[PDB]
Design a protein around this nucleic acid. Structure first.
Lengths: 248, 301, 67
DNA sequence: TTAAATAGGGAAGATAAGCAAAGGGTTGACGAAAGCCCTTTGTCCC
DNA sequence: GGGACAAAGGGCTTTCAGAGGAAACCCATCCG
């Protein structure tokens, strides 16, 4: 809770709205945690936590039956019948504008970080989308908990995701509690033996399924503790927030 | 059997415009002044049948009025009327039913209908309750650059006249297939100085005012539907009830609550599909059907 | 899963997916309440099959390292 | 180019009637997992 | 030249199966 960097009003087009087989819409916090990890490994700067807020979002299409994207022949098994309307294999798309906050541990200077971040953002992606435009990053300094409200308020205006936990399961909680599920981690099922077609022959491979937790959307000025709005990697392949379950 | 089509409609062949009211003198009818409406608040008692307990309470209402100034003693009501031809031409549908009806029709006499249509404007039935309280009513009609002046009384019991005939014959020719003709009508009255006029009222939901009057840019006027209703009050071809009413299918007046031409084998639709199915109609039935076809409406179902 | 999902329907007309998932006879058979004759044969079909072609592959942080 | 000082109490807000019918709402393209046959290429044997 | 295997490609294809169903939500502050 020392150094934060803010990038607000980032326009991304063509975001992959399909996060799982039952969740279509906002990417989960895992996507932003992976983006932060990619920034850390590529840039060489340790990043602690990531916070994301939704300024605008819209899934392409209508209220129901979102959309279908046309496919093309790109495999080496055809050539005779590859002339008319390849099959679908549906994949939804959406368009959104977000705002990001990154917890950074860097004290060498004050202006080099802005340049190094701007260099990475110009060639980065958000859930497969392309970044159209963004504002100039700026750095905020927090020494204690009381001034954390200022760096929190620096993110206006946007809607931040907070964690409320699961009671029984997402299906019953969504109808009763009126919240929306989200993916917070993966559970391993069984180890991959054949390492031929994998993208890496050194990293161990696993079959995993998403684990669901229920979240809520809150205005930035209405957040009690800012530590509840920051996400980071946890134990047993999970993503958790610093402040735990959000309580009013 | 040649049943009527599912969708079948006709257009309107007589087009009146919204009449306008002016205040002029009987001897200085050249310069005209408009009549405004304004608003007033009145106080009175509560007299409701069946509510005698609140007979000692007050009542405050807000209404709209309209009256002549104290230096003008003549109300001038002016409007235009347009007659168009090409009757027996269905606007929607009709390839054999309309043609059969036209063949059964057009043998009737348009002269009487044209005479009565012009008489209802010349005598002065187009102007409503504004008639009472006046000792002299003068009508000026302009058509084809030829001015005519009328002071005809006895709006009921259509009588013979000379000037009415030479416009009725012109209208009759246009009715049975021609282009269009236009009449300009002006009415002068002698109500007096400061007398009250009665512009047309309008339908309104709950609001502050209890009675508002139709106006155009603050000047009192009359609805064209009301003007056209009085012109077609020529139905004298039923068994009783003289002082005729307007020509409508199941000819009825909602004000009185009685419906003439009820289900006793004299209706528009019965005669329409009986004429095409063999037997023809009488002279009064033919004139009624033709007069009601000149009026608009949709028939089918 | 069976090739082309053909199977054979019952006299009233039902497939296995409807039969086993109607009123929880799957747990009634998996536990063994219907005997040990319909218990071994059903469990014989529960075999793994590995296939990774055209699947997403994502890196996840696991302590010191990646998976 | 002025200092202060206040700005009414009471009553009360109408009722009845009705809101139409008929006709129609498009087509074409977006499959996986095999069976057989033929051809070509390449390897091995005779 | 004949037999076997694999891969690629096309075509003869063609085998396989099958009518549910009902409706516009979440939410009010920094800054010049």
């Amino acid at each position: 809770m020392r150094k934060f960097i803010i990038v607000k009003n980032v326009k991304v087009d063509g975001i992959n709205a399909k996060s799982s087989d039952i969740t279509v819409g906002m990417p989960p916090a895992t996507t932003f945690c992976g983006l932060g990890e990619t920034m850390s490994i590529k840039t060489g700067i340790v990043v602690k936590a990531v916070s994301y807020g939704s300024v605008k979002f819209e899934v392409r299409g209508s209220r129901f039956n979102t959309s279908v994207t046309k496919f093309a022949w790109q495999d080496r098994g055809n050539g005779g019948k590859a002339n008319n309307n390849s099959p679908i294999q549906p994949k939804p798309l959406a368009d959104g504008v977000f705002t990001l906050c990154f917890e950074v541990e860097w004290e060498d200077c004050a202006e080099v970080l802005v340049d190094k971040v701007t260099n990475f953002i110009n060639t980065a992606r958000i859930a497969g989308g392309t970044i159209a435009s963004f504002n100039k990053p700026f750095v905020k300094v927090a020494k204690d908990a009381e001034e954390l409200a200022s760096v929190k308020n620096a993110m206006m205006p946007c809607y931040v995701v907070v964690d409320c936990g699961v009671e029984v399961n997402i299906f019953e909680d969504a109808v009763n509690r009126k919240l929306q599920p989200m993916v917070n981690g993966y559970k391993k099922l069984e180890k991959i033996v054949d390492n031929k077609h994998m993208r890496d022959k050194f990293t161990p491979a696993y079959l995993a399924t998403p684990t669901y937790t229920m979240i809520g959307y809150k205005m930035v000025s209405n957040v009690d503790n800012f530590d509840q709005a920051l996400w980071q990697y946890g134990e047993n392949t999970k993503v958790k927030t610093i402040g735990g379950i959000y309580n009013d | 059997k040649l049943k009527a089509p599912a969708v079948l409609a006709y257009s309107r062949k007589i087009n009146p415009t919204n009449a306008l009211m002016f205040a002029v003198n009987w001897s200085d009818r050249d310069n005209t002044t408009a009549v405004m409406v304004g608003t007033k608040t009145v106080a009175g008692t509560q007299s409701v049948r069946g509510n005698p307990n609140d007979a000692d309470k007050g009542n405050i209402q807000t209404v709209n009025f309209a009256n002549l100034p104290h230096n003008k003693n003549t109300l001038l009501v002016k409007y235009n009327v347009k007659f168009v031809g090409d009757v027996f031409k269905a606007e929607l549908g009709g390839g054999e039913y309309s043609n059969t009806l036209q063949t059964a029709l057009e043998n009737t006499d348009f002269g009487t209908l044209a005479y009565r249509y012009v008489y209802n404007i010349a005598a002065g039935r187009t102007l409503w309750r504004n008639r009472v309280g006046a000792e002299s009513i003068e009508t000026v009609i302009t058509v084809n650059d030829q001015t005519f002046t009328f002071s005809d009384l006895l709006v009921n019991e259509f009588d013979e006249d000379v000037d009415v005939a030479e416009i009725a014959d012109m209208v009759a020719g246009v009715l049975s297939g021609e282009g269009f003709v236009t009449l300009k009508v002006e009415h002068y009255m002698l109500l007096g100085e400061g007398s009250e006029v009665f512009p047309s009222q309008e339908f309104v939901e709950n609001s502050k005012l209890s009675k508002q009057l139709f106006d155009l840019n603050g000047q009192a006027a009359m609805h064209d539907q009301k003007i056209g209703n009085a012109i077609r009050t020529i139905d004298t071809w039923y068994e009783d009830a003289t002082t005729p009413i307007a020509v409508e299918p199941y000819g009825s007046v909602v004000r009185n609550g009685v419906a003439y031409r009820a289900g006793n084998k004299t209706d528009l639709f019965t005669l329409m599909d009986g004429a095409v199915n063999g037997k023809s109609l009488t002279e009064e039935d033919q004139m009624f059907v033709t007069a009601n076809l000149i009026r608009g409406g949709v028939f089918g179902g | 899963y069976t090739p082309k999902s053909a199977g054979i329907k019952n006299e009233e007309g039902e497939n296995l997916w409807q039969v086993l998932n109607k009123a929880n006879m799957f747990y009634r058979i998996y536990s063994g309440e219907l005997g040990e004759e319909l218990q071994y044969l059903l469990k014989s079909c529960c075999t793994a099959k590995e296939d990774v072609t055209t699947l997403p592959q994502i890196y996840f942080k696991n302590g010191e390292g990646y998976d």
